[PDB]
């Protein structure tokens, strides 16, 4: 089946950088747009960044614009999120998720989450 598997993450100090990965399988990679969501501890879900792999269209939430970059490796079927100049407010569980169609317009598959903590 379709599976989204994230890795990367762990703990860094303010100013640090990490690169999250979301490896997919089970479907034609360029046919679905992919998004990063986060859930800061005890809060709800918040959208972070999206990319359409067909034409390379990307979009970012105002809190991360300029510091994060979303990208894809189409030969490895992997989604990435490069996070630079991290700060303590970026602590959260980050989820990648697939968007079904553009009765559509919903997230149909979610990755298992990976934790990023920013602290000294």
């Amino acid at each position: 089946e379709v599976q989204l598997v994230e890795s990367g993450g762990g703990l860094v100090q303010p100013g640090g950088s990490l690169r999250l990965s979301c490896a997919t399988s089970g479907y034609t990679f360029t046919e679905y747009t992919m998004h990063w969501m986060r859930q800061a501890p005890g809060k709800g879900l918040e959208w972070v960044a999206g990319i359409n792999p067909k034409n390379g269209g990307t979009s970012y939430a105002d809190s991360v614009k300029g510091r994060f970059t979303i990208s894809v490796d189409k030969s490895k079927n992997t989604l990435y999120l490069q996070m630079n100049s991290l700060r303590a407010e970026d602590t959260a569980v980050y989820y990648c998720a697939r968007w079904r169609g553009l009765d559509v317009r919903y997230f149909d598959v979610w990755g298992q989450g990976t934790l990023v903590t920013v602290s000294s």
Binding site: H35, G44, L45, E46, W47, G50, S59, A61, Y95, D103, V104, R105, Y106, F107, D108, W110, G111, Q112, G113
Partner: protein, 107 residues
């Protein structure tokens, strides 16, 4: 961002009970409203999309209705496995935005 308001933010009920969770958007969302369940430590899972369509495998005790700005999720007979947090999300305008969650707690 279209703002989404979920209510109640928490409720206490017992097994067997019927309950309705509500989500109001700040403008007409044109039925692009979806529901997710999330248990502690786990990723969200889709229950219902486009207001009323149940994802395959989701129990028939779950149903959804609504139109314009107002949308609801009803569980006809709460089971032990249903005590969890629920989120609605609108897909009408980008970025996608979520309600703040409704915690269903045991009484």
């Amino acid at each position: 961002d279209i703002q989404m308001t979920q209510s109640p933010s928490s409720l206490s009920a017992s097994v067997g009970d019927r309950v309705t969770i509500t989500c109001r958007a700040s403008q007409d969302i044109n039925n692009y409203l979806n529901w997710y369940q999330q248990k502690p430590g786990k990723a969200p899972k889709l229950l219902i999309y486009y207001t009323s369509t149940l994802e395959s495998g989701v129990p028939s005790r779950f149903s959804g209705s609504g139109s314009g700005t107002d949308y609801t999720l009803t569980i006809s007979s709460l089971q032990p496995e249903d005590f969890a947090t629920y989120y609605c999300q609108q897909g009408n305008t980008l970025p996608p935005t979520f309600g703040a969650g409704t915690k269903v707690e045991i009484k």
